[PDB]
Design an enzyme around this catalytic site. Structure first.
Site, PDB file in Angstrom:
ATOM      1  N   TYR A  94       0.855  -1.185  -0.052  1.00 11.68           N
ATOM      2  CA  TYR A  94       0.041  -0.006  -0.075  1.00 11.68           C
ATOM      3  C   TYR A  94       0.970   1.231  -0.122  1.00 11.68           C
ATOM      4  O   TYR A  94       1.801   1.390   0.506  1.00 11.68           O
ATOM      5  CB  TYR A  94      -0.732  -0.071   1.178  1.00 11.68           C
ATOM      6  CG  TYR A  94      -2.357  -0.710   1.101  1.00 11.68           C
ATOM      7  CD1 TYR A  94      -3.343   0.138   1.278  1.00 11.68           C
ATOM      8  CD2 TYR A  94      -2.344  -1.936   0.524  1.00 11.68           C
ATOM      9  CE1 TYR A  94      -4.576  -0.748   1.196  1.00 11.68           C
ATOM     10  CE2 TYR A  94      -3.497  -2.654   0.582  1.00 11.68           C
ATOM     11  CZ  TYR A  94      -4.688  -1.607   0.706  1.00 11.68           C
ATOM     12  OH  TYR A  94      -6.032  -2.396   0.290  1.00 11.68           O
ATOM     13  N   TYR A 137      -9.358   2.647  -1.708  1.00 10.68           N
ATOM     14  CA  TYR A 137      -9.940   2.973  -3.033  1.00 10.68           C
ATOM     15  C   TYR A 137     -11.368   3.715  -2.592  1.00 10.68           C
ATOM     16  O   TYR A 137     -11.551   4.917  -3.518  1.00 10.68           O
ATOM     17  CB  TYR A 137     -10.396   2.246  -3.916  1.00 10.68           C
ATOM     18  CG  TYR A 137      -8.848   1.493  -4.588  1.00 10.68           C
ATOM     19  CD1 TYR A 137      -8.200   2.373  -5.175  1.00 10.68           C
ATOM     20  CD2 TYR A 137      -9.028  -0.007  -4.622  1.00 10.68           C
ATOM     21  CE1 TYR A 137      -6.864   1.949  -5.839  1.00 10.68           C
ATOM     22  CE2 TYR A 137      -7.892  -0.483  -5.403  1.00 10.68           C
ATOM     23  CZ  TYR A 137      -6.796   0.205  -5.776  1.00 10.68           C
ATOM     24  OH  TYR A 137      -5.849  -0.328  -6.619  1.00 10.68           O
ATOM     25  N   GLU A 166      -0.763  -2.163  -7.786  1.00  4.38           N
ATOM     26  CA  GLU A 166      -1.586  -3.271  -8.272  1.00  4.38           C
ATOM     27  C   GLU A 166      -0.767  -3.948  -9.515  1.00  4.38           C
ATOM     28  O   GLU A 166      -0.957  -5.282  -9.683  1.00  4.38           O
ATOM     29  CB  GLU A 166      -3.026  -2.701  -8.790  1.00  4.38           C
ATOM     30  CG  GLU A 166      -3.865  -2.133  -7.948  1.00  4.38           C
ATOM     31  CD  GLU A 166      -4.465  -3.173  -6.928  1.00  4.38           C
ATOM     32  OE1 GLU A 166      -4.102  -4.300  -6.730  1.00  4.38           O
ATOM     33  OE2 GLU A 166      -5.292  -2.734  -6.106  1.00  4.38           O
ATOM     34  N   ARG A 180       1.196  -6.208  -7.633  1.00  7.03           N
ATOM     35  CA  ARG A 180       0.403  -7.299  -7.302  1.00  7.03           C
ATOM     36  C   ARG A 180       0.282  -8.420  -8.035  1.00  7.03           C
ATOM     37  O   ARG A 180       0.144  -9.612  -7.864  1.00  7.03           O
ATOM     38  CB  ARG A 180      -0.746  -7.024  -6.575  1.00  7.03           C
ATOM     39  CG  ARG A 180      -0.474  -6.004  -5.067  1.00  7.03           C
ATOM     40  CD  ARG A 180      -1.733  -5.628  -4.780  1.00  7.03           C
ATOM     41  NE  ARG A 180      -1.591  -4.649  -3.531  1.00  7.03           N
ATOM     42  CZ  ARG A 180      -2.064  -3.477  -3.495  1.00  7.03           C
ATOM     43  NH1 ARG A 180      -2.945  -3.005  -4.249  1.00  7.03           N
ATOM     44  NH2 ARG A 180      -1.499  -2.643  -2.363  1.00  7.03           N
TER      45      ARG A 180
HETATM   46  N1  LIG Z   1      -3.120   3.893  -0.415  1.00  8.76           N
HETATM   47  C1  LIG Z   1      -3.572   2.737  -1.079  1.00  8.76           C
HETATM   48  N2  LIG Z   1      -2.327   1.923  -1.545  1.00  8.76           N
HETATM   49  C2  LIG Z   1      -2.869   0.699  -1.974  1.00  8.76           C
HETATM   50  O1  LIG Z   1      -1.929  -0.075  -2.777  1.00  8.76           O
HETATM   51  C3  LIG Z   1      -3.996   0.355  -2.098  1.00  8.76           C
HETATM   52  N3  LIG Z   1      -4.457  -0.683  -2.731  1.00  8.76           N
HETATM   53  C4  LIG Z   1      -5.809  -1.291  -2.535  1.00  8.76           C
HETATM   54  C5  LIG Z   1      -6.968  -0.411  -2.242  1.00  8.76           C
HETATM   55  C6  LIG Z   1      -8.163  -1.081  -1.574  1.00  8.76           C
HETATM   56  O2  LIG Z   1      -9.138  -0.163  -1.229  1.00  8.76           O
HETATM   57  N4  LIG Z   1      -8.253  -2.234  -1.708  1.00  8.76           N
HETATM   58  C7  LIG Z   1      -9.526  -2.846  -1.392  1.00  8.76           C
HETATM   59  C8  LIG Z   1      -9.600  -4.440  -1.963  1.00  8.76           C
HETATM   60  O3  LIG Z   1      -8.867  -5.058  -1.035  1.00  8.76           O
HETATM   61  C9  LIG Z   1      -9.771  -3.033  -0.150  1.00  8.76           C
HETATM   62  O4  LIG Z   1     -11.168  -3.311   0.487  1.00  8.76           O
HETATM   63  N5  LIG Z   1      -8.987  -2.450   0.806  1.00  8.76           N
HETATM   64  C10 LIG Z   1      -9.471  -2.403   2.561  1.00  8.76           C
HETATM   65  C11 LIG Z   1      -9.120  -3.372   3.291  1.00  8.76           C
HETATM   66  C12 LIG Z   1      -7.785  -3.838   3.278  1.00  8.76           C
HETATM   67  C13 LIG Z   1      -6.731  -3.156   4.018  1.00  8.76           C
HETATM   68  N6  LIG Z   1      -5.365  -3.900   3.861  1.00  8.76           N
HETATM   69  C14 LIG Z   1      -5.698  -4.724   2.901  1.00  8.76           C
HETATM   70  C15 LIG Z   1      -4.351  -5.471   2.285  1.00  8.76           C
HETATM   71  C16 LIG Z   1      -5.025  -6.562   1.632  1.00  8.76           C
HETATM   72  C17 LIG Z   1      -6.365  -6.574   1.195  1.00  8.76           C
HETATM   73  C18 LIG Z   1      -7.368  -5.755   1.763  1.00  8.76           C
HETATM   74  C19 LIG Z   1      -7.023  -4.980   2.599  1.00  8.76           C
HETATM   75  C20 LIG Z   1      -8.869  -0.931   2.949  1.00  8.76           C
HETATM   76  O5  LIG Z   1      -7.810  -0.442   2.285  1.00  8.76           O
HETATM   77  O6  LIG Z   1      -9.306  -0.615   3.998  1.00  8.76           O
HETATM   78  N7  LIG Z   1      -6.469   0.694  -1.538  1.00  8.76           N
HETATM   79  C21 LIG Z   1      -5.082   1.084  -1.678  1.00  8.76           C
HETATM   80  N8  LIG Z   1      -4.805   2.470  -1.143  1.00  8.76           N
END
Ligand SMILES: Nc1nc(=O)c2ncc(C(=O)N[C@@H](CO)C(=O)N[C@@H](Cc3c[nH]c4ccccc34)C(=O)O)nc2[nH]1
Length: 268
Positions: free
Chosen positions: A81, A124, A178, A181
């Site tokens: 992230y 997101y 992404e 990944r």
């Molecule tokens: N700043 C950021 N960097 C990223 O690489 C990123 N990559 C993806 C997402 C995103 O919303 N992903 C969705 C789909 O997985 C989600 O529901 N995220 C949640 C749950 C979550 C937190 N950490 C995770 C690690 C793996 C899978 C899901 C999660 C969230 O950000 O709160 N947001 C990002 N934001």
């Protein structure tokens, strides 16, 4: 005095970018995210957050511009992230999810003059609300990335509106995190860079982004690769694609988030 070691930096520029220079960049980011300690069904797993020392917790990605501007993003190695970024004398961090992440982020960009933590998280859904547009309506490619680097760089000075900053983060996360990944999403970005044609991501890209954690957990909990419960993804044209096994995902997913311990019977 400079505190012991220093997080790794990987450089990429959008100026004159090619498929080969973008492939080299993404391969380098993967190589700094994973350690080789954890590979299941031929798919590397990111480091486990539990017990991971702070000196090994981040990598830096230094982005430059045909406009001759540079911003540095900080990625968390546990999930790839983007947790924040530096532009010159300011750094900005997304609101942390918990106290341990808040402390960790004090170890980044430690001598920047001005440090800000946004009041919003960087997921997101939050960033789409801020941008006033969904991922499916935000074009990706080398042009969008070049524009996003300048938008992040000018944010300090009031040049960049919040909706344009959110859309810029959405571009960066998909073209860097992404792509790291998913080899499939790396390949989608290589196509846009080869032809210099920006386009929004199709349902194959969106459903993989939305399912990375479910797919990581399905693979890790599988019985010899077989999922207890299929996962439904979408093809390009939106039609349903059922995933029953890790085998079909070997060409598609490049890295998993750590979800469970590997049971006895495998990396030996
Ligand atoms: N700043 C950021 N960097 C990223 O690489 C990123 N990559 C993806 C997402 C995103 O919303 N992903 C969705 C789909 O997985 C989600 O529901 N995220 C949640 C749950 C979550 C937190 N950490 C995770 C690690 C793996 C899978 C899901 C999660 C969230 O950000 O709160 N947001 C990002 N934001």
């Amino acid at each position: 005095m400079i505190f012991p070691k220093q997080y790794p930096i990987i450089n990429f520029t959008t100026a004159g970018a090619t498929v080969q220079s973008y492939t080299n960049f993404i391969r380098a980011v993967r190589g700094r995210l994973t350690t080789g300690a954890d590979v299941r069904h031929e798919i590397p797993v990111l480091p486990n957050r539990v017990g991971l020392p702070i000196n090994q917790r981040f990598i830096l990605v230094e982005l430059s511009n045909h406009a001759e501007l540079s911003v540095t993003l900080a990625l968390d190695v546990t999930n790839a992230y983007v947790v924040g970024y530096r532009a010159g004398n300011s750094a900005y961090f997304f609101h942390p999810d918990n106290q341990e992440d808040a402390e960790a982020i004090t170890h980044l960009f430690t001598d920047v003059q001005n440090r800000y933590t946004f009041a919003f998280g960087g997921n997101y859904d939050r960033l789409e609300q801020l941008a006033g547009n969904l991922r499916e309506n935000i074009e990706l490619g080398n042009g969008p990335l070049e524009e996003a680097i300048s938008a992040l760089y000018y944010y300090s000075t009031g040049g960049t509106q919040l909706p344009t900053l959110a859309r810029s983060f959405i571009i960066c996360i998909q073209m860097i995190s992404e792509a790291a990944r998913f080899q499939y999403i790396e390949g989608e970005m290589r196509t846009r860079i080869r032809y210099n044609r920006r386009s929004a991501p199709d349902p194959s890209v969106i459903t993989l982004e939305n399912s990375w954690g479910r797919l990581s957990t399905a693979i890790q909990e599988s019985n010899q690769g077989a999922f207890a419960s299929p996962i439904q993804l979408q093809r390009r044209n939106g039609s349903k694609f059922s995933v029953y096994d890790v085998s079909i995902l070997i060409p598609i997913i490049a890295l998993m988030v750590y979800r469970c311990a590997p049971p006895p019977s495998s990396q030996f």
